[PDB]
């Protein structure tokens, strides 16, 4: 996160750390959607141009964390993965279309003050909240600049109109993506950055006061550049695939 601020304790309890066993390293963000399921960006697992291909065995998940580097001795829960599922039409070859993956935890986690799942949007919630101008919230432990924070970072960013998104890059945008950030004119800034992928883009419903995951941190070009925007996987749109895997496994 660039131009964000230190989260408050318990602010984003669905926030998960994607952790490499050896070398020990922060890989990405992720989010807790149930006591057994974690959502993340498929490119955190699989990205062949960079020779990245991780397996169940390559990783750990750390839940209820605040500090990046400290072992949060009676707060955080570390869990092993049982199974990784990547969207079958995830497009690593061209544009990260469908950048989404599910991780099934070995044993379920116990929810606490620091551990709690986020809601998945419904057709109706998506419809009302996913509008240009409406702000969402991004969290993560990624780069502070185009570096590593000591505590979880947060930033509030507005959704941007499709055409503006399109005109900002040479990358082919698809309906499975949305962009967000401030316009240079708006002179307010901030963005996700490398190490932030898989982190949730969340909105708070004004109807029922619940937090919903609308996005997943996917890609960008640079971090917090004027005229550029963060791109996110559109969760509602990949909803049936998510349902489909949980209903099957």
């Amino acid at each position: 996160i660039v131009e964000g601020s230190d989260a408050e304790i318990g602010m984003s309890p669905w926030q998960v750390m994607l952790f490499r066993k050896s070398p020990q390293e922060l890989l990405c963000g992720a989010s807790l959607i149930s006591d057994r399921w974690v959502l993340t960006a498929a490119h955190c697992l699989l990205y062949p141009p960079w020779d990245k291909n991780f397996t169940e065995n390559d990783l750990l998940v750390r839940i209820g964390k605040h500090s990046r580097t400290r072992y949060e001795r009676n707060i955080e829960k570390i869990s092993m993965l049982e199974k990784i599922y990547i969207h079958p039409r995830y497009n690593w070859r061209e544009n990260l279309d469908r950048d989404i993956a599910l991780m099934k935890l070995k044993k379920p986690v116990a929810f606490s003050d620091y551990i709690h799942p986020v809601c998945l949007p419904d057709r109706e919630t998506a419809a009302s909240l996913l509008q240009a101008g409406y702000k969402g919230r991004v969290t993560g432990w990624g780069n502070l600049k185009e570096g590593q924070p000591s505590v979880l970072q947060v930033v509030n960013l507005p959704i941007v109109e499709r055409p503006v998104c399109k005109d900002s890059t040479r990358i082919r945008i698809t309906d499975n993506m949305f962009c967000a950030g401030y316009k240079p004119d708006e002179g307010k800034r901030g963005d996700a950055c490398e190490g932030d992928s898989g982190g949730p883009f969340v909105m708070k419903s004004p109807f029922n006061n619940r937090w919903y995951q609308m996005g997943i941190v996917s890609w960008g070009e640079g971090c917090d550049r004027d005229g550029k925007y963060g791109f996110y996987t559109h969760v509602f749109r990949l909803k049936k695939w998510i349902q489909k895997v949980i209903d099957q496994f």
């Binding site: 602010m11 309890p13 708070k204």
Partner: peptide, 26 residues
């Protein structure tokens, strides 16, 4: 079920420092 309702905030009727910024945008 209980999703999206934070034990230290919603549950206790406490607001975090910048959630008003989101609701004001809607």
């Amino acid at each position: 079920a209980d999703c999206g309702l934070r034990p230290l905030f919603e549950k206790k009727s406490l607001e975090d420092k910048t959630e008003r910024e989101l609701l004001e945008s809607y």
